[PDB]
């Protein structure tokens, strides 16, 4: 039995895969995939930055994709911002 916190962490991987499996490399989220991700998964205060700004910020190696470790930057920022909001 995984705890609820542990299941939450595994679910973060599932969310990435929903998008990384759309096309091309299954370990890559491309710019249009990332736009769908932000629209579907993130609140307005994250979306309003814009998918192009977010893509440039997350694509650390400038290879035209967001890999899982790069996606974790977005998760960290969303968690920190959500935590701020909740109080």
């Amino acid at each position: 039995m995984l705890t609820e916190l542990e299941k939450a962490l595994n679910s973060i991987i599932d969310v990435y895969h929903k998008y990384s499996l759309i096309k091309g490399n299954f370990h890559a989220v491309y710019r249009d995939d990332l736009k769908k991700l932000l629209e579907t998964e993130s609140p307005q205060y994250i979306r309003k930055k814009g998918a192009d700004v977010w893509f440039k910020e997350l694509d650390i190696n400038t290879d035209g994709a967001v890999n899982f470790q790069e996606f974790l930057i977005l998760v960290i920022k969303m968690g920190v911002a959500a935590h701020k909001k909740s109080h």
């Binding site: 995984l2 705890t3 939450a8 595994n10 973060i12 974790l72 998760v75 959500a82």
Partner: protein, 89 residues
């Protein structure tokens, strides 16, 4: 209406808070609070580490980047990302 990603982040925030609020600064984890959370809520992910209290203390000390003997949410979330990565790998 909450997305899957939002639910997972809420789970993280609410788990942090369950412990942070019990004692001391209500929005940070002191050492006893961090230990309790890791012991219960990361009993599988940190199974080996939980066998040694000093290992857990060292984990906290590493995460405590402003050296105040407490983990803010900012500090704690770096652990959650490391653990997701480790699970992924």
């Amino acid at each position: 209406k909450m997305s899957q990603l939002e639910r997972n982040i809420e789970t993280i925030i609410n788990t942090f808070h369950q412990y942070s609020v019990k004692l001391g600064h209500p929005d940070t984890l002191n050492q006893g609070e961090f230990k309790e959370l890791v012991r219960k809520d990361l009993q599988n992910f940190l199974k080996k580490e939980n066998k040694n209290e000093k290992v857990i203390e060292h984990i906290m000390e590493d995460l405590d980047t402003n050296a105040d003997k407490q983990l803010s949410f900012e500090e704690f979330i770096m652990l959650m990302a490391r653990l997701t990565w480790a699970s992924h790998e």
